Amino acid sequence: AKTYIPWKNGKLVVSEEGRYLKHENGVPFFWLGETGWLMPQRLNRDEVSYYLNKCKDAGYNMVQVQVLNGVPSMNIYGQYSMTDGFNFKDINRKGIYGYWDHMDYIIKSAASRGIYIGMVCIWGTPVEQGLMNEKEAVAYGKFLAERYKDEPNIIWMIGGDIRGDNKTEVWDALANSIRSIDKGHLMTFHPRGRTTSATWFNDREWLDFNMFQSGHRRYGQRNYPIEENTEEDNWRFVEASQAKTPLKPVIDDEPIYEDIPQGLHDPNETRWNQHDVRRYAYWSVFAGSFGHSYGHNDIMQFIRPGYGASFGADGRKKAWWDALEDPGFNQMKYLKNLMLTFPFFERVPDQSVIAGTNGERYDRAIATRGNDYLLVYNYSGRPMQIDLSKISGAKKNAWWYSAKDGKLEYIGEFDSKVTSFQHDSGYLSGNDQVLIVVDSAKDYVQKAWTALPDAIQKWNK
Ligand SMILES: [Cl-]
């Protein structure tokens, strides 16, 4: 089938209930993000095409980058991002393929594949180091907005692994400068680990939605902006952000990365794996997030042999082109395809769908529902009691949905009451399921299906 181009449906807009993203014509936008931080600095033209092809084929519709990782930044071609600080008057040179011409090419390359670029204007580190002041932030924002306002596939990202109370004046100057010119793209803030942008900027008129970073510490790794022994409960950040008024959408834009060490800095520590990657994804979305962003330790830094690695990556062991074949990267599509199968905007998180005593930590089942359907993600497989009366219908149909491979298995028809469910698979064996329950009068899911069809095709002609 033809390439799905999301912006054929119009610009991205925050939906009326303040929880999800939609296009202008009302079509849902389930954000499925990939993290390609060092793509502008490390990938050449052919590598950009290959990486974005792989992202498109794995269902990603948002790839985020560090537009600038330094002052100045340098790309693989040996081109500077700035010649005279933040003075961009003479940045374009006739017959020269410049740093910003390669940035233009990355955005056009994503556009032909139906992918939005998440533009982290400037990573937090050079800003924290005082390399961009308020005056320069205004000039940089003017340059970025005038260059990219007419490119449809852009999402502005202020910050970049930094607290909102760190160089606040600089971030506000940058955000308001872009915002004065570009009213056709959504904007947000990428915060420090274990923080949410909602803590500082929920009430900012330039912020359309919030993001948080739940990565990359394990339970009990304080060695603090969060409660002790709650590190891996990324659903807590969703709750904390949405408790703030006005209600705005939220997403985990930086959960744990596949193959990154627990706590980042010890390369001999236990690495986060595909099962953990799925757990963070479903926990964030079922808590109320509008979508999810994934990352891989080898891909985000585009590691290859002969490059120094961050956080225990090893170019000689696995390069970014090999990490594109890893399980977690290729399982995110099953989360996106599931969410797009059901009425999208009436969805709410609802732990009251789980009756009896819910489990703790990895045994905490998590539920979300519409008016006529409910979804319960159970990472461990611990038996559950589900209150089927929380959705419509005298009778309900139920299915098991395998998060690792999208396998669908019909269970049967049930009367509307508190019902026991347990999946026939190893406990804590990486056979995490979503329990799908739908009012028997609705046909979002068919009884004979062993997979979900491509839900996007409803809006692709
Ligand atoms: Cl900080």
Shape: globular
Rg calc:
22 Å
Can you list the strand order of the major beta sheet?
Answer: 7-6-5-4-3-11
The number of helical segments is: 12
Largest sheet: 6 strands, parallel
Specify the structural class.
alpha/beta
CATH H-tier superfamily of the largest domain: Glycosidases
Q: Can you count the beta strands?
A: 20
- The figure for the number of domains is 2
Bound small molecules, by name, code or SMILES, are: chloride ion
Secondary structure: helix percent? 10-25%
Percent range for β-strand residues: 15-25%
CATH level-3 fold name of the largest domain:
TIM Barrel
CATH class of the largest domain: Alpha Beta
CATH architecture of the largest domain: Alpha-Beta Barrel
End-to-end Cα distance: 10 Å
Pfam families: Apiosidase, Collagen_bind_2
InterPro entries: Apiosidase-like_cat_dom (IPR025277), Collagen-bd_put (IPR024749), GH (IPR017853)
Domain Putative collagen-binding: 348-437
Keywords: Signal
In short:
This protein has two domains: 1-231, Glycosidases (TIM Barrel); 232-461, no CATH class. 23% of the residues lie in helices and 19% in strands.
Model description:
With 461 residues, the chain is an alpha/beta fold. The protein folds into 2 domains: 1-231, Alpha-Beta Barrel (TIM Barrel); 232-461, no CATH class. Helices cover 23% and strands 19% of the residues. The protein has helices at 39-42, 45-57, 99-111, 124-128, 134-148, 168-181, 198-201, 235-242, 274-287, 297-300, 320-323, 332-339; strands at 12-14, 21-23, 32-35, 62-66, 116-120, 154-159, 187-190, 195-196, 210-213, 250-252, 292-293, 348-349, 354-355, 366-369, 373-378, 384-387, 395-402, 408-415, 418-421, 433-439. Helix 2 (45-57) packs parallel to helix 3 (99-111), helix 5 (134-148) packs parallel to helix 6 and helix 8 runs parallel beside helix 9. The termini are close together. Chloride ion (CL) binds at residues 162-163, 166, 192. Residues 348-437 form the Putative collagen-binding domain. This is DUF4038 domain-containing protein. Residues 15-346 form the Apiosidase-like catalytic domain. It holds the Pfam family Apiosidase.
